[PDB]
Amino acid sequence: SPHQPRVVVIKKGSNGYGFYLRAGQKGQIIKDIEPGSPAEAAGLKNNDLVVAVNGKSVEALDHDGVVEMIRKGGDQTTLLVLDKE
């Protein structure tokens, strides 16, 4: 029985969120989490596929579109993520 999708809230720190996004070339996967960052502390990991931002599906979007969805939410973001194998 596979692990379920989950919601992770991250607040931007002085040095940003501390996660990055890269296509695996479908949806964006969380990558390059900075040690000691809000991303790490909130429970993101580097096989998380981002499927929604702030309740909005990002499944049809490219890198620029996912980035924009996140940036326009100000200084926090609410991600729905699920495991990529």
Helix ranges (H only) for 1-85 are: 38-42, 63-71
Q: What share of the chain is helix, strand, coil (3-state, %, to 5)?
A: 15, 40, 45
HSE (CB half, 13 Å, CA atoms) of 44? 30
| 17-76 positions binding Cl ion, by CB under 5 A | 17, 20-21, 71-72
Is the Cβ of residue 56 or residue 72 nearer to Ca ion in the bound state? 72
Q: What's the token pair of residue 34?
A: 């900075």
Kindly list the residues in this chain that would bind Zn ion in the complex (CB under 5 A): 51, 64
What does 64 bind: Cl ion, Ca ion, Zn ion, none (CB cut-off 5 to 8 Å by kind)?
Zn ion
- Please give the residue whose beta carbon sits closest to Zn ion in the complex: 64
Distance, in Å, from the CA atom of 36 to the CA atom of 52, rounded to the nearest integer, reads: 24
Is the Cβ of residue 11 or residue 72 nearer to Ca ion in the bound state? 72
- Please give the residue whose beta carbon sits closest to Ca ion in the complex: 72
The contact set with Cl ion (CB under 5 A) reads 16-17, 20-21, 71-72
